């Protein structure tokens, strides 16, 4: 597990057309379920039950996005439609340039993710926890939009 | 807070619904949070499931809103609504209502 | 300092699965901007469309990857801006990275490396040659593409 | 596909104009390339400049074609003309001559 430098980027436009941007850094780790590649894209929150095969024609999202998934304590859903891998893989199938798992509730996932070395996806898969997780989620719940930039150094 | 909710989280909204109600994944911009709803909104229809009750995508031709898999309510503009289905012109043995998008 | 650029075509299906075409190419990371990897939707720019000469210009969506074809410097004798000037203005204007094509104006590479005193936050890349042709082709023919640039 | 054009490139279109004409950037998908025009289209206006002639965005609230940065030629439908600006109501310092779509 190499360390994932995740820079969440808030931005303003102004009447003159220009942008100012500032940067929260968080830290996570890349899993073996996905590449050691940096990624960057618009952040989109994916609910956990909202990455499954079962939905036939799910909602459409612009390609090039960043999944952020808040996993819970595993007994809150004991019969999940997929594994963490299956969701990471779905996301990527549906254009995620990368996925950020907030595993705060379920440290178990880290293990599940690196066991999926057999299929390691095109795109990177980051796990984050702790205060670093808090920041991300609050950015999500408060901010209108934002931009994630995941770095592998 | 999160309403109609059995298990719930600050971030994902509703995780399990009270049994009668339907689970709806709503987008408010960046967030997508669970909701527990009585009626699905326009463009959707309720479904009772053993796993859980769930609000599904109204997949049917030229129909803005529907009640079921294949029963329409309001058709999209210029389509005439008869018998739960949407039609281009009103069908043989049927006639469009005055001032209405509805046949007879 | 090598820039490993991926240019990526994408189209959806009805299920919202994405089939992709991916072209790689090589440039160099100019010190006028940062050495960092970056991702974004491609947007070409007229180099004459990159001047601080309009007080109010139209808003692009933050996060784009700019591509600017440089033309022989005789075609604009007294520019609205420097090369450096033009790049910084793309970044100021939302570019998450700037890709320059210095084919017709390779001296710019030197003018660009003038900026290594006060380096921009974002990647400022140069390409040329076949690599530039490959890039421009995609730009000119396709509706959209997404650039992934890696610093390794 | 490269007209009004002194200098012309396959990648950027027009780089300089024949000197009667106004310079413009066409955004066609990812592309931006130059056109040399006699008319700046609706939404824009011409500013004879020392370097070249160019079209600038008319950003006067409620004006179609600008005469200058700060003067309007054509108001949008139902918009009253004064100081070469547009109004839904003619302000103080001008009695609205209705038929003509102006103020006095």
Author numbering:
A (entry chain A): 53 to 205
B (entry chain B), D (entry chain D): 39 to 142
C (entry chain C): 54 to 205
Study authors write:
The crystal structures of the ZNRF3ecto–Rspo2Fu1–Fu2 and RNF43ecto–Rspo2Fu1–Fu2 complexes revealed a 1:1 interaction between Fu1 of the Rspo2Fu1–Fu2 and a single ZNRF3ecto or RNF43ecto chain. Neither the Rspo2Fu1–Fu2 nor the ZNRF3ecto dimer show major conformational changes on complex formation. The first, extensive, area of interaction involves hydrophobic interactions interspersed with hydrophilic (complementarily charged) patches contributed by the first two β-hairpins of the Rspo Fu1 and the region immediately carboxy-terminal to the β3 strand of ZNRF3ecto. The Met-finger at the tip of the second β-hairpin of Fu1 nestles into a pocket formed between the β3 strand and the αC–β7 loop of the ZNRF3ecto, which is lined with hydrophobic residues (I95, I191, V192, A198). The αC–β7 loop is a flexible region in the unliganded ZNRF3ecto crystal structures and moulds to interface the RspoFu1–Fu2 M68 in the complex. The acidic region of the β3–β4 loop (immediately adjacent to C104 of the disulphide bridge) becomes more ordered in the ligand-bound ZNRF3ecto structures, probably as a result of electrostatic interactions with a positively charged patch on Rspo Fu1. For all ZNRF3ecto–Rspo2Fu1–Fu2 complex structures we determined (from five different combinations of species and crystal forms), the dimer found in most of the unliganded ZNRF3ecto crystal structures reoccurs. The overall assembly thus comprises a 2:2 complex of ZNRF3ecto–Rspo2Fu1–Fu2. The 2:2 complex resembles a crab with the ZNRF3ecto dimer forming the body from which the two Rspo2Fu1–Fu2 ligands diverge, without interacting with each other, as the pincers. Notably, the β1–β2 hairpin shows less conformational variation in the liganded ZNRF3ecto dimer structures, always maintaining a tight embrace, consistent with the Rspo2Fu1–Fu2 interactions contributing an indirect stabilizing effect on the dimer via the β3–β4 loop.
